[PDB]
From a paper:
To assess if the introduced amino acid exchanges affected the overall structure and the binding of the oxime, we also crystallized the tyrosine variants in complex with selected oxime substrates. The protomers in the crystal structures of the tyrosine variants are perfectly superimposable with the ones of the wild-type enzymes, confirming that the exchanges did not lead to major structural alterations. Interestingly, the binding mode of the oxime substrates also did not change in most of the structures. Testing the tyrosine variants for oxime reduction showed that the exchange of the non-canonical tyrosine Y370 to phenylalanine in OPR3 led to significantly decreased product formation compared to the wild type (OPR3_Y370F). This is true for the transformation leading to pyrazine 3a and the cascade with the alcohol dehydrogenase ADH-A leading to the amino alcohol 4a. In comparison to the wild type, the non-canonical tyrosine variant Y370F of OPR3 showed a 4-fold decrease in both kred and Kd in the reductive half-reaction and a 3- and 2-fold decrease in kox and Kd in the oxidative half-reaction. It is clear that Y370 plays some role in the binding and in the reactivity with reduced nicotinamide adenine dinucleotide phosphate (NADPH) as well as with the oxime. The effect of the Y370F mutation on the oxidative half-reaction is a clear indication that this residue has a role in the catalytic mechanism.
The biocatalytic reduction of the oxime moiety to the corresponding amine group has only recently been found to be a promiscuous activity of ene-reductases transforming α-oximo β-keto esters. By studying the crystal structures of enzyme oxime complexes, analyzing molecular dynamics simulations, and investigating biocatalytic cascades and possible intermediates, we obtained evidence that the reaction proceeds via an imine intermediate and not via the hydroxylamine intermediate. To gain more insight into the reaction pathway, we determined the crystal structures of the two enzymes OPR3 and XenA in complex with the oxime substrates 1a–c, either by co-crystallization or by soaking. All the crystal structures obtained had a high resolution (1.9–1.35 Å) and showed clear electron density features for the oximes.
Numbering used by the authors: 9 to 286, 297 to 385
Amino acid sequence: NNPLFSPYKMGKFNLSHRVVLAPMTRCRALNNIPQAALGEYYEQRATAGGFLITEGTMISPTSAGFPHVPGIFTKEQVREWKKIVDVVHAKGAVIFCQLWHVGRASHEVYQPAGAAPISSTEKPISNRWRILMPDGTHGIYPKPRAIGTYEISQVVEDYRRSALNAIEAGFDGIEIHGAHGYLIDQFLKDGINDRTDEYGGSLANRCKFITQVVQAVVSAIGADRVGVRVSPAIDHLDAMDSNPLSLGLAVVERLNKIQLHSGSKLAYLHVTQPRYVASEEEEARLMRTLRNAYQGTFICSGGYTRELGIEAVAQGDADLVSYGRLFISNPDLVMRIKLNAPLNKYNRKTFFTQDPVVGYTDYPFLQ
Ligand SMILES: Cc1cc2nc3c(=O)[nH]c(=O)nc-3n(C[C@H](O)[C@H](O)[C@H](O)COP(=O)(O)O)c2cc1C
Ligand SMILES: CCOC(=O)/C(=N\O)C(C)=O
């Protein structure tokens, strides 16, 4: 029996299997408005009792660092998301919206009035990394503006309002993108956060921002509708920490405490495998250490295959396994994993293009 097809109770959500659509930016949401193409894409991948997480979704006008990514901060966006959620729900799937602020991982071209992007720090991402521009060229990450505590409270409110908007659109819940060197990770990582106020210095202070964000969304929509994604060890956008395992455990402690205070568990903790990029034992150590420390559901992501996903669930390393790239090219990935059917190759060249069909909805199902 395939352990990926054991049912799982993710809080009040009864999942029929443990294969999850990982959140993936695809850049088809023209002008930050969800489009009908997204509805077709998510519908193709939805299964009865399966869990889907959307592409990262803007919480405010300053939260983007990619072209044509959806927002959920306007009523127009909420109206269009509702059409997509309705088609996914008609297939019996559960869907969460990932709330995403990129912080310093942006460019003047993506910011209102060409202003600098915001961060914990004035330190830019280094020139080892370049940003995808709307014309398909690559640009230079600029120096961000370091925000004060009033503005931090405004950003927390943007997460809270976006969570309420997601519920209004019919989403089952939201995921906080606290990973991958984006805004929240720019507060978490000691390689980035050079602040001397209450949001920097100590590990406890560096965890303040994520704690406040999670508390705000939990208060607004309930813990069982909130998932949290982190990546304490990741090679992405110069987001390093001197002690990744202690950073991860400090975040896990905060999430455990939020749950005890709220009297309810979060939907899940979602952790990226350190092997994933845009020793193996230290990486496996870290994943299992975080899972064992967290009082709740654990989703693993990053480089998983059918075999590795089966092993993760069978060995108790994770409750759910999210797949990215293979879900791009296999709309029926769940069925293919169930049948052990051969998988289709994916085309990286069309990961972030704008076409509503090509490289998006035209990967074939099984015959
Ligand atoms: C095209 C693409 C876009 C992605 N965008 C996001 C994103 O918006 N938010 C996020 O948390 N992770 C994002 N990721 C990481 C994925 O959620 C996932 O963790 C990763 O793809 C898993 O590894 P796999 O592709 O080997 O299955 C993205 C990955 C890809 C390939
Ligand atoms: C490498 C880790 O970063 C990611 O996967 C990502 N978003 O989180 C994108 C847009 O690629």
